Amino acid sequence: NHNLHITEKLEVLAKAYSVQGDKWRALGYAKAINALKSFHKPVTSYQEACSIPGIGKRMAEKIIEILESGHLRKLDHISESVPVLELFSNIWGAGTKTAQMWYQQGFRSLEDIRSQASLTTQQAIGLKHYSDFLERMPREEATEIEQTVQKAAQAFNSGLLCVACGSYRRGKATCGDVDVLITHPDGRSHRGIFSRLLDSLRQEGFLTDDLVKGETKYLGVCRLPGPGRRHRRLDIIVVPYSEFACALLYFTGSAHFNRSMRALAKTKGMSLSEHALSTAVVRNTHGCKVGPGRVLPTPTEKDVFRLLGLPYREPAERDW
DNA sequence: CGGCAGTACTG
DNA sequence: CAGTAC
DNA sequence: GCCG
Ligand SMILES: Cc1cn([C@H]2C[C@H](O)[C@@H](COP(=O)(O)OP(=O)(O)OP(=O)(O)O)O2)c(=O)[nH]c1=O
Ligand SMILES: [Ca+2]
Ligand code: NA
Ligand code: NA
Ligand code: NA
Ligand code: NA
Ligand code: NA
Numbered sequence: 001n002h003n004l005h006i007t008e009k010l011e012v013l014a015k016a017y018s019v020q021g022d023k024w025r026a027l028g029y030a031k032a033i034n035a036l037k038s039f040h041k042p043v044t045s046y047q048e049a050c051s052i053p054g055i056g057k058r059m060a061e062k063i064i065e066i067l068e069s070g071h072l073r074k075l076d077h078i079s080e081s082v083p084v085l086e087l088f089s090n091i092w093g094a095g096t097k098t099a100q101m102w103y104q105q106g107f108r109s110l111e112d113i114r115s116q117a118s119l120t121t122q123q124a125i126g127l128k129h130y131s132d133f134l135e136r137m138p139r140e141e142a143t144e145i146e147q148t149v150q151k152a153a154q155a156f157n158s159g160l161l162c163v164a165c166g167s168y169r170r171g172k173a174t175c176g177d178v179d180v181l182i183t184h185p186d187g188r189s190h191r192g193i194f195s196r197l198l199d200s201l202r203q204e205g206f207l208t209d210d211l212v213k214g215e216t217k218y219l220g221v222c223r224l225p226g227p228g229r230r231h232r233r234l235d236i237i238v239v240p241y242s243e244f245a246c247a248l249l250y251f252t253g254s255a256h257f258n259r260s261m262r263a264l265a266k267t268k269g270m271s272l273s274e275h276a277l278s279t280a281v282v283r284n285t286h287g288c289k290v291g292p293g294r295v296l297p298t299p300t301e302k303d304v305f306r307l308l309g310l311p312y313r314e315p316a317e318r319d320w
Numbered sequence: 321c322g323g324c325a326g327t328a329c330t331g
Numbered sequence: 332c333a334g335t336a337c
Numbered sequence: 338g339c340c341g
């Protein structure tokens with residue numbers, strides 16, 4: 001990217017808006033930052049600024065102020081609460097509303113939180129792993145965590161397929177957590193083995209805490225055995241085989257890629273989720289689904305793209 | 321003006 | 332439900 | 338914040 005001196009300043013404002021709960025404004029900044037991250041050359045004109053998709057007059061004004069001043073004045077009037085709100089919302093299970101409430105209650109540090117705040121069960125796990133959950137692991141370690149889950153699941157049924165998704169499948173060198181998708185061509189055997197799997201991984205000491213436990217979705221905390229190991233976030237989802245392609249696509253991301261793809265499906269009277277790509281979806285004037293539509297067969301990720309009129313993108317090309 | 325992805329846990 | 336999360 |  002040849003616009004670092006601009007995007008670096010925009011990232012600051014976008015994070016401020018995010019921690020402060022202004023999610024749609026933050027969203028607009030994010031997209032503009034990506035667009036600026038993509039454009040081939042340094043932006044030099046307000047007209048060249050408005051020329052990019054995701055950059056309006058408001059954002060070009062800011063970009064222009066940067067090129068002529070080397071500075072964005074609004075960065076000087078970011079509230080003093082923002083660093084504290086960021087600190088608090090980096091606790092897993094605390095978001096903007098909880099951080100803002102803690103702030104209004106007078107809390108300013110994690111010592112304040114530890115000693116005086118009311119914490120949910122999730123937020124107490126998040127706090128005790130605060131530093132660890134802010135770390136990314138090398139992908140080599142994501143592979144060891146995936147193999148640990150896979151070998152535990154395959155002990156129950158050899159026919160279980162286990163695939164690490166998210167940034168791991170997109171080829172990144174580091175991973176924020178591990179996303180393991182499980183299915184079975186059986187169409188049936190995926191049922192039941194999920195709860196038994198978690199008990200097996202608990203019994204050996206691999207799983208150290210549970211955050212979310214659904215019937216096909218688990219979010220938790222694991223740590224490989226031996227010295228020099230940190231606690232790592234682990235997500236596991238178990239899906240029927242008929243949903244594998246859409247679950248793989250969802251679980252692989254990126255998040256912004258999924259949202260773009262789902263928005264595109266909406267323009268075409270379709271709807272894409274981790275369960276299925278559906279056609280003939282009826283919506284009202286507020287974009288809210290009013291009728292379900294029909295599931296389209298998607299045996300492979302390529303079918304989803306094809307049915308959406310798009311060229312296939314391999315995982316590494318799905319960061320946005 | 322008004323949507324901005326679609327879904328799933330928690331309590 | 333609101334909040335938080337993937 | 339942007340865009341239809
Ligand atoms: C956070 C998030 C994730 N997802 C999907 C796509 C993500 O790849 C997948 C796993 O969630 P993450 O683990 O948060 O995604 P990631 O692995 O891509 O993160 P990073 O690039 O920083 O390493 O869940 C959504 O569809 N929407 C979201 O808001
Ligand atoms: Ca991940
Ligand atoms: Na534009
Ligand atoms: Na958080
Ligand atoms: Na006090
Ligand atoms: Na994850
Ligand atoms: Na809750």
